[PDB]
């Protein structure tokens, strides 16, 4: 099995895991902080997706240190996995172009 596609799938699974655990840990870290909105699991998961995609709707964000740390982990997981998919596509296209020219 090709390495780039394997790492791509691994980053997909790992990203899903980081999204779910990030929602759970976000709710756990944010409850107890007055004014916090990241306190229900469904919209904590929605916020996890927003964070991993950096879509920037700005409707939900953590206010505590540990919630912000969880947030950073989700950000870096999304940036890393999506950049990994980009790199895998690059490797694929370079292979197909290398065969297209008979080299």
């Amino acid at each position, epitope marked *: 099995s090709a390495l780039h596609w394997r790492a791509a799938g691994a980053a997909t699974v790992l990203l899903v895991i980081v999204l779910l655990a990030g929602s759970y840990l976000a709710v756990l870290a944010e409850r*107890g902080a*007055p*004014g916090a909105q990241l306190i229900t*699991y*469904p919209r904590a998961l929605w916020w996890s997706v927003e964070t991993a995609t950096a879509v920037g709707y700005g409707d939900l964000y953590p206010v505590t240190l540990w919630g912000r740390c969880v947030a950073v982990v989700v950000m870096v997981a999304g940036i890393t996995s999506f950049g990994l998919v980009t790199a895998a596509l690059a490797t694929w296209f370079v292979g197909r172009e290398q065969e297209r020219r008979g080299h």
Partner: antibody
Amino acid sequence: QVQLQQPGAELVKPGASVKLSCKASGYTFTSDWIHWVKQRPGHGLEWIGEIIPSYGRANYNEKIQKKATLTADKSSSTAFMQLSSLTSEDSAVYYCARERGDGYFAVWGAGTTVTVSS
Amino acid sequence: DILLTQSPAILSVSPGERVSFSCRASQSIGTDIHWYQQRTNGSPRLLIKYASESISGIPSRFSGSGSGTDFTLSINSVESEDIANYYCQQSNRWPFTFGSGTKLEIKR
């Protein structure tokens, strides 16, 4: 079956303490939170605090004088609220309730009538 | 924290008429409002979740409406068993808070 089992009454002496119990049944999840709500006779509902049994983290209402300490035994599926140094201002019905993680109480216990008197 | 004002505190209606309880929040909270019913010496019973979503086992004459800061619990054709106290619990920001409650009376 009744999902949350609470004792009917507890008699406390002024200055003493009491540990209220809340035994769970039905569907339990790692995402479950158990809340405790205070209702003095004739008054409304007052949120006391919450605990996530699968983790043990508990949060309390900041605006009131902290008299409670929340714990949970995971094997017996039981939530405990320890009220300490009780004044006549603490005589009330104390409910426990379960919350799947949406922020509303789907099921409540029958409530424990706490009377602090000599 | 988020304050929930339930006014009036007492609502008196005739049997069979439509009644509406009001619940106003001190800040915008979307639809994160839930409604409970407590009869005399009873435990609170969830009637409506998320301002308008139905609960299984609750009579269909119970409905909810509103969003932001103004919410309404409505009963079509009030009857004797509807006599109770009604609370509107909020859960948009920590900590969760309750309204002060509205008692429903029936003039028979």
